[PDB]
Design a protein around this ligand. Structure first.
Ligand SMILES: CCCCCCCCCCCC(=O)O
Lengths: 61, 252, 277, 238, 238, 61, 61, 238
């Protein structure tokens, strides 16, 4: 089938950890949640300044 | 000039100098039944020019208070030359038809007709509690007319125009093969109807394949001394006429 | 795939091009778009007519019938159901099907059977789960005249046995019509002499459907209501037509009462003032 | 057997599902397919067909052909509004029942442009120029020709070409609008005026009929399947 | 386990389903297959076999061989109809019980041609010509030989070849017809007349028997499985 | 098996979107609806004229 | 697995029409019916004659 | 069919499951995606944004801007503690409601460092040095500057650079801590003192406001999803 093997979340016996998935429905809205999308970009809220500010330097000068 | 057009079928020919193109059914043109779609095993008969020609029906008068008219085919052509003879002697039939409605006036008259071909135009009864009679549905080349008001007949058809005798809106009949006859631009209307039915062939007396309705949306009008007689003639010619099941003629 | 047309960017104009001018007399519907009668900007339209498909439109279970049958043989209550299959007794689905003259498709039939115990002063029971039997009888097959008729043997007629509590019974059926397509409208008669039956009933004959309780008897009177649902799939439709305007009166013909073309209003120039600061 | 765990929604019956199911009639030989004229694939094919619009839908004409009549007269009528209405393809009583609107009522969302075709049915001697304007939501309905002229308009000149199309562009904030349009999803209004006037020769009618047609464009589309509110019953028919 | 969702129609029991199921008798050694004569693969193999038709099914013969007898006499009988009946392979009382019709009653739909074989059982000295006609639905039953002769007919000349076949072609509007034929799915009628007459020598019978056989052709086929209305009971047999 | 992978309808997280299907029954009538057939040809109803009409031109001349 | 793809019976949308099957039980008696065996030979009953008879010829001569 | 065995947990409904399910609206055309500014991917993006901390949360200021005011005065104030509080990002009333703490209340576990930014809002002429100390759990809260100075401290010198950051390092025994911190998962305290004092010129205020900001670092993270105890109701709203 259109099987798609992904990686499972670390277990309590770490340091065959993968699962299989197949969509049965025609609408993408039927698929399960995307609990594995780990994107980040705090810059939008933490550093929305026009002029890049270097940590080790004075904010104003 | 696309205004002028000529039609030739059999030993008949129609002329026009003020037409508005030609509507061809649902994009299809009349054609004989193919072998991979036939059911009747007997070899069909195809009179061709004998039945596929222009048949003119009784003219009708358009008046300032006319509500409309309607004909049912192939029934309406039961007494038309050899086309009607094949209907009697055969159990099954199949034809195309080229509807050509004529109606001329003058640059001083005004009005607008709606020439439409309604497949399986099943109609309702005046008295919703009773049924309709074939005699009230179609009466040969004699046209039945729509009324501007409700009807009461026992087994009569609800001739009230606004519902086209089908329980629908007249303004939506444009979804069927049609054309208009706007006197200020037109002079006639032609529609080439292809055989439309859920069966390869069918009886021509028991089944009314389609209904031709001529409903005016713009009342006929004119000034004094202007010809008050404005007739509307209907001409139709069968196309690719096939017949099966030859037997003793049917007594009408 | 089923995407909609995009709008080409248009600018000023001044030529002999007359896309706005036409003649409806030809029976031709104008193929004009905004860019033809004004200055428009380019727009990548991603909209899709995927849900306008005749398949997606008609492929949805809709109730077509409903009858009630009792368990005990008291009074003149019917202990079994009978039904001359057709979809002309439920205005909703009937109106959709009638948007087209001819139809061709397979169909998914689902049954929603529910029971109850009729009111009473002393009706303490303990009846086991009720099992039902739905039997389809194509035209000509023997019809049962009782809840114990031999016809319920279902020797060759398709039949379903369902017990309450479980998911509503279902099953698909192909294209039964003896014609090349189902006919929603038949402007003809059943007899060559142009009389007898007129319209739908003149040719359509999908047979009958019977139901009953397979349980012998209940201490106190109980009744069940079966609801039949139709869901056409693998659809094909031909010759579209004006939607039903007048309310449906009979389920055997198209009789109707002169109905208004639409709702009324003050005048042709009437437009409600919705801006009142 | 294979260890299985039933998920919520099991044994239920959703009218809009789509699963496989055993055929009650195994090996049934379906009747040969026949190529029938005028097949429909998408309902939009219907909503794109012009249908007469009952603009003159006043109580007295709700059952006569006058409902479709849009009279125009000779003589001074400057400042007079020939007609007007809201742009609610599925809610407006004027469009509510046309082929187009009739279909929109089976859906809750709509989008795209609309083609309002006007046909002059007067005599071949009558002449005139009409101003067909369309004003997007935001301000009051045009009370004068000047106000209407400021919006998207079309100056129709009557002549050999009987019909004239006034394409109402889709100028909305959101991508879609509700068929059950509210003030938020307002579409605007359409008002018709006299650009000049209708001049006519002697011995010719002074009143003429102007039919209105409405249909969707190639950029139109519906979206939310729902039941139409134009049909119901109180008991099983018989 | 594997997340599963039960679809409607689960746990039900449809008499016409077709699933797998555990065998109550594991590893059972089936009795060796033996090649037995006359195996049937398709029921149509039976409906294609000629069977005597009880054309003379009048109340007085419903239980005698006379039911199959179709008398023909010497002498002038012009204008006289030897026999006639409708074309309802499964509904017509004449065919209703023949091998052919008997099978059609297990189905609701039928299609194809039919072979009506007629055999002259008179003496070897008797001669004659009969007109076997078939008239498709549409008009009244042939009242005269001329009317019948206008339809699909076969002029049978009695001679060394005892039998003569009158193949009734499938001339229907629809691809199939109901076994429970109604007026809509009418098939027509079959009338027999005297083409000439039955001449006979002295010392020879004047009345002769003509048997009728009916069977399906290579283009015949049934379609809708149903229960036959020719068998029932009021209680379990014992 | 006779698996057949198709494309799912766009989801609310666009701009692995495919599903698998296998028919278990012998009759085609048992299969699921064809919700993905997007064919069109309005010409039948909008332009059923014998002579092609060019938009930018006069309907009659 | 021992999957076996066959052809489905024509649907009401003709003129992916195949299904998959796998037997789970050890006894052939557990398998589904053979609704797709279309063999024929009417000769046994319609023409059980010792001497071939040609249609276009006399039965006896 | 395929022999199956249902495992425990079937037909149940767990609010945190994640299975597939049939769409009630087949082939719905979702509205085109539009790139909107400020998209959030992880809630930590919010907890990393500085938010004013109501350090002066005394009953009399629970509804005034004074709740955020941290006064500092000129003159001898040696040995005086400017302010102090526990390190409970989600439990401490001081942080409990900040953007950071507000998010932690949707989780039961937390880990990482915290950035306490202090901004001097006095006049441009006012000068001074403050001692921002942080003492890990284990001993009593610093009663004197000497005691506080023994812990992780930051000597802030007021000048052109208005703000000064006191990063509280994650010095815990366990990898994570409970938002509902108890004595076991204690984090310590934060006390502010006068390193020197606030000297000011003539004609200049003697009292100044010092705002406090709190946010998470790049090493912060929450873990146990739970419901926030800062919102509830007694009946359906209307
Ligand atoms: C096993 C149950 C069989 C039910 C047959 C239903 C057939 C429905 C046909 C609908 C025809 C029409 O709507 O024109």
């Amino acid at each position: 089938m259109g099987a798609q093997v992904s990686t499972q979340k670390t277990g309590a016996h770490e340091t065959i950890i993968h699962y299989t998935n197949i969509n049965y429905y025609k609408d993408a809205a039927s698929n399960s949640a995307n609990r594995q999308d780990f994107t980040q970009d705090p810059g939008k809220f933490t550093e929305p300044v026009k002029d890049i500010m270097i940590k080790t330097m004075p904010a104003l000068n | 000039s696309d205004r002028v057009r000529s039609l030739t079928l059999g030993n008949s020919t129609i002329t026009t100098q003020e037409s508005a193109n030609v509507v061809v059914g649902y994009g299809r043109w009349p054609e004989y039944l193919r072998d991979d779609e036939a059911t009747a095993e007997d070899q069909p008969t195809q009179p061709d020019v004998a039945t596929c020609r222009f048949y003119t029906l009784e003219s009708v008068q358009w008046e300032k208070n006319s509500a409309g008219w309607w004909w049912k085919f192939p029934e309406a052509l039961k007494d038309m030359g050899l086309f009607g003879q094949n209907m009697l002697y055969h159990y099954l039939g199949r034809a195309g038809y080229t509807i050509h409605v004529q109606c001329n006036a003058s640059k001083f008259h005004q009005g607008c007709l709606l020439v439409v071909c309604v497949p399986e135009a099943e109609m309702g009864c005046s008295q919703t509690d009773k049924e309709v009679a074939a005699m009230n549905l179609t009466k040969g080349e004699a046209a039945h007319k729509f009324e501007p008001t409700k009807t009461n007949g026992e087994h009569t058809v609800q001739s009230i125009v606004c519902n086209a005798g089908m329980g629908v809106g007249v303004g939506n009949l444009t979804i069927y093969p049609h054309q208009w006859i706007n006197l200020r631009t037109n002079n006639c209307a032609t529609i080439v109807m292809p055989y439309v039915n859920s069966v390869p062939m069918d009886n021509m007396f028991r089944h009314y394949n389609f209904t031709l309705m001529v409903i005016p949306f713009a009342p006929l009008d004119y000034a004094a001394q202007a010809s008050e007689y404005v007739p509307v003639t209907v001409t139709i010619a069968p196309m690719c006429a096939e017949y099966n099941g030859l037997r003793l003629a049917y007594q009408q | 795939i089923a995407r909609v047309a995009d709008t080409v960017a248009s600018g000023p104009s001044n030529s002999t091009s007359i896309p706005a001018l036409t003649a409806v007399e030809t029976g031709h519907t104008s193929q004009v778009e905004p860019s033809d009668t004004m200055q428009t900007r380019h727009v990548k339209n991603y909209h899709s007519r995927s849900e306008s498909t005749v398949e997606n439109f008609l492929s949805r279970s809709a109730c077509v019938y409903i009858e009630e049958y009792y368990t005990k043989d008291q009074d003149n209550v019917n202990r079994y159901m009978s039904w001359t299959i057709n979809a002309r007794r439920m205005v909703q689905l009937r109106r959709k099907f009638e948007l087209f003259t001819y139809m061709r498709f397979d169909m998914e039939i689902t049954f929603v059977i529910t029971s109850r115990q009729l009111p009473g002063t002393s009706i303490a029971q303990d009846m086991p789960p009720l099992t039902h039997q739905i039997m389809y009888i194509p035209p000509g097959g023997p019809v049962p005249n009782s809840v114990t008729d031999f016809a319920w043997q279902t020797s060759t007629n398709p039949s379903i046995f369902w017990t309450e509590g479980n998911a509503p019974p279902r099953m698909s059926i192909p294209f039964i019509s003896i014609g090349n397509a189902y006919s929603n409208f038949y402007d003809g008669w059943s007899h060559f002499s142009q009389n007898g039956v007129y319209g739908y009933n003149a040719l359509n004959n999908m047979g009958k459907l019977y139901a009953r309780h397979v349980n012998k008897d209940t201490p106190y009177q109980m009744s069940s209501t079966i609801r039949v649902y139709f869901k056409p799939k693998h659809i094909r439709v031909w010759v579209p037509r004006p939607p039903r305007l007048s309310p449906y009166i009979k389920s055997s013909n198209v009789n109707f009462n002169p109905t208004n073309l639409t709702d009324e209003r003050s005048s042709i120039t009437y437009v409600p003032d919705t801006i009142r600061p | 057997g294979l260890p299985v765990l039933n998920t919520p929604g099991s044994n239920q019956f959703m009218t809009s599902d789509d699963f496989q199911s055993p055929s009650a009639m195994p090996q049934f030989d379906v009747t040969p397919h026949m190529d029938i004229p005028g097949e429909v694939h998408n309902l939009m094919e219907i909503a794109e067909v012009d249908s007469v619009v009952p603009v003159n839908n006043i109580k007295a004409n709700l059952q006569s052909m006058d409902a479709y009549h849009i009279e125009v007269n000779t003589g001074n009528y400057q400042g007079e509004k020939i007609f007007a209405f809201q742009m609610q393809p599925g809610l407006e009583s004027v469009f509510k029942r046309t082929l187009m609107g009739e279909i929109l009522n089976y859906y809750a969302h709509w989008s795209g442009s609309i083609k309002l075709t006007f046909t002059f049915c007067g005599s071949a001697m009558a002449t005139g120029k009409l101003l067909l304007a369309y004003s997007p939501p935001g301000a009051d309905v045009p009370a004068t020709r000047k106000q209407a002229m400021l919006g998207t308009h079309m100056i129709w000149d009557i002549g050999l070409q009987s019909s004239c199309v006034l394409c109402i562009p889709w100028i909305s904030q959101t991508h879609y609008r509700l068929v059950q349009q509210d003030e938020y999803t307002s579409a605007g209004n359409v008002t018709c005026w006299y650009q000049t006037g209708i001049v006519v020769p002697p011995g010719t009618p002074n009143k003429c009929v102007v039919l209105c047609f409405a249909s969707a464009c190639n950029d139109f589309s519906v979206r939310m399947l729902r039941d139409t509110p134009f049909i119901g019953q109180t008991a099983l028919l018989q």
